[PDB]
Design a protein around this ligand. Structure first.
Ligand SMILES: [Mg+2]
Ligand SMILES: [Mg+2]
Ligand SMILES: [Mg+2]
Ligand SMILES: [Mg+2]
Ligand SMILES: [Mg+2]
Ligand SMILES: [Mg+2]
Ligand SMILES: [Mg+2]
Ligand SMILES: [Mg+2]
Ligand SMILES: [Mg+2]
Ligand SMILES: [Mg+2]
Ligand SMILES: [Mg+2]
Ligand SMILES: [Mg+2]
Ligand SMILES: [Mg+2]
Ligand SMILES: [Mg+2]
Ligand SMILES: [Pd+2]
Ligand SMILES: [Pd+2]
Ligand SMILES: [Pd+2]
Ligand SMILES: [Pd+2]
Ligand SMILES: [Pd+2]
Ligand SMILES: [Pd+2]
Ligand SMILES: [Pd+2]
Ligand SMILES: [Pd+2]
Ligand SMILES: [Pd+2]
Ligand SMILES: [Pd+2]
Ligand SMILES: [Pd+2]
Ligand SMILES: [Pd+2]
Lengths: 172, 172, 172, 172, 172, 172
């Protein structure tokens, strides 16, 4: 139907809409975890700042997929953005571990999306995913793993001194 | 319980959490309506840009309420962000009319929040709402009403020429 | 035979030569449609300017493929550049519709070229096509679809006012 | 028929269209000869650069004639651009000799065009040809003759040293 | 085992380690060939400079693969860097021919690595190889072929004048 | 045989070639230890940066000896660069202790080289070693000893806090 549509499978269109929801969900998780560190009884302002920037990035990831959907002649279909579903995230270390499992979850979805684009012989969509998403995830996952390792080695989450100093020297 | 909490009623805390969800819902509506105008079969790029900026503003409104919740010693509680629920919004005029009813809905909620802060004798929260939200809504509603009036007088939504020229001369 | 040639199939070499001819043909179509709008009885100078730039871009697309052919050790083989073969293109809207079907035709050829590079396990050539051509086509097709939509909604090709104002406000 | 047409003979209009095709053919010859020197087994990059600039100039010559056709109220009529028809051009010296016979061929056509404009008492067209084309050809032919003379005297096309040094010191 | 590892096959990890050794070997070959031209009985300082820069580039290629290995959660495993194994490279032309066969050998290994990443459905690793290595090799091979062609045509390796002048005018 | 050779003993020539291999081996050790700290399960980026710079310096040490060999009319002879042979180096403290024993090993070799130059009455080579190598080693050894002392006193390698803070405040 769309005058611009070419070599864009219905399954790919649907998968892009699911990915948009997941990026928005990731933005919401990061937003929630950010303001946890803004609480007066937590008060790690660079943890807060770090996760807020992460939240803004995920919203940008979602918007680029919305742009892509329209570029290819698909039609955006939106769903509820679920509230964050994490259950053991309330410390500097545990929130970083959550960010890690979130970004690996997003990466898994992107890899499945790339497999679908490959199966439907959509090289433009393959290149879009590779160019704008796959290395971003690899770098994000590496960064979070680095952070988790340092917080553990410094003695978190027991040592409040560790999270304080990490907040100042790594996130500051 | 919170060491900073003072003169902050439980009902106010809950109402602030409900307002956070409504601001996020408004951000989502504006985001949806923005990328409608980015479709190749609509293609009004300044309508798209206008609503995207609106979406970003609403996200800022939500974040300031999250900051306020922590400032006062309340605890943020998040809910699903519902997908946009508009049913007759797919033209330049109809999307502006939707923005108008959305901003009046947000304003009504803020007025109810101010009534609660007044009833609970919370002058800080009253001043917060007045200072950061009530005149913003009045200006937003006035702007949208202006836009709706011009689009109607120019002959929208029938006249595609009208929406094209409004996009260029008012939103451009 | 070529001292630089490696993993470059004869079929790919031939397909690159066919693509060079198609890019040159596209340059010629755009050149023809450009000077139509330079006629004294048409006189839409930004339509003329728009298509002339398009023509120059296509010539650059051809030259990069000629460079690629030599980079990989293939040998350029040129054919006649056929005169433009469009039969219903003489209005602002109809010329944009022609540009649209031209760019989709070029995109189809590039997708077939990518399928061949994939079948011959030529990842360099795959990456070359993805990096320099496939997203350029997607953006070009999206832009032209946008333009066609606006011209139709404004009342072209009947309304001479529509093409005049589009020339000034979108192409100007 | 054209509201601007005045003192512009049908024969002149047709001759201008034939000249447009010849300028485009010249652009194509120069483009072909340019990328010959970009081959890995030729590899004279300033020969390549020299002929590519020549190719771009010829395209400009064609566009100015298209502009002239519209200025005078004639109607552009395009034909296939034939692939280059040279048969003994594959060395630095031989390609320069080809450029020489090409530019003299274009000059002969322009002189015949001027004779027609003179016979049809078209002083504007006479002045256009004299002002924009005839001295350009005389300078081009003189330059190419200079180049051919130097390449011969230096010992080309036998001496690969000669073409290498000419590429560096004259075309570089 | 690695907390960051995802979709990264053991075979790919091993192949990346083999590629690191090959890049380091290439750096060593180029370093050896560079200081040959620094000998008082050879004394071509721009040949020396050219190959030394090449050597530094290969070391950068190795370091980026080491970075990639850690990014993906693999573990770097190093081997001896073998001394250069070339047997007929001691002239300006012969060293360029060696550089040519070295870069084609590295390219073949990278193409085999890309085939493995493709077989293991690792699009991140495919994109990494395409983006950072495959076009670099194509450009390197084209450049070296150009150089070899010019040195041969100028009369090297017999003509000491040829290597002297190439050193000054192409490598200088 | 070399036209420049004067007062340069065959034994010195051979010893310079052995020293070149040792400098390259040192570069490789430092490169290996650098990317250990780039691992996601180590993640001390200033340790990584420190050892990478050290690696680059050792490569410069090797190149200056290659230059010296040619300056004096000797002939460079290269050997395999052995993979790093350290067996107890995988912590911030242990890697610094390794760097210390490496630099003392290089210093011992340089002192033996100076003894040979002295025995062969080669004052140019004596001055070369003294001027470019001996004080560099003394400063390097002093620096590493300082680093080892601080890491021990801070409680490394047990205290992950110690290596983290040293990475930030001394290597950062
Ligand atoms: Mg992120
Ligand atoms: Mg729920
Ligand atoms: Mg691919
Ligand atoms: Mg607003
Ligand atoms: Mg619902
Ligand atoms: Mg008041
Ligand atoms: Mg285009
Ligand atoms: Mg025909
Ligand atoms: Mg010329
Ligand atoms: Mg023919
Ligand atoms: Mg190279
Ligand atoms: Mg051996
Ligand atoms: Mg050192
Ligand atoms: Mg061994
Ligand atoms: Pd989580
Ligand atoms: Pd979480
Ligand atoms: Pd609505
Ligand atoms: Pd709406
Ligand atoms: Pd057409
Ligand atoms: Pd056309
Ligand atoms: Pd010719
Ligand atoms: Pd020719
Ligand atoms: Pd070799
Ligand atoms: Pd070699
Ligand atoms: Pd060691
Ligand atoms: Pd070591």
């Amino acid at each position: 139907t769309s005058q611009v549509r070419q070599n864009y499978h219905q399954d790919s269109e649907a998968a892009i809409n699911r990915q948009i929801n997941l990026e928005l969900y990731a933005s919401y998780v990061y937003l929630s975890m950010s303001y946890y560190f803004d609480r007066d009884d937590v008060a790690l302002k660079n943890f807060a700042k770090y996760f807020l920037h992460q939240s803004h990035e995920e919203r940008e990831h979602a918007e680029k997929l919305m742009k892509l959907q329209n570029q290819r002649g698909g039609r955006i279909f939106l769903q509820d953005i679920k509230k964050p579903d994490c259950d053991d995230w309330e410390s500097g270390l545990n929130a970083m571990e959550c960010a890690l499992h979130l970004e690996k979850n997003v990466n898994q979805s992107l890899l499945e999306l790339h497999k679908l684009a490959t199966d439907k012989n959509d090289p433009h969509l393959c290149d879009f995913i590779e160019t704008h998403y796959l290395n971003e995830q690899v770098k994000a996952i590496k960064e979070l793993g680095d952070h988790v390792t340092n917080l553990r080695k410094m003695g978190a989450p027991e040592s409040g001194l560790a999270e304080y100093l990490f907040d100042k020297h790594t996130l500051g």
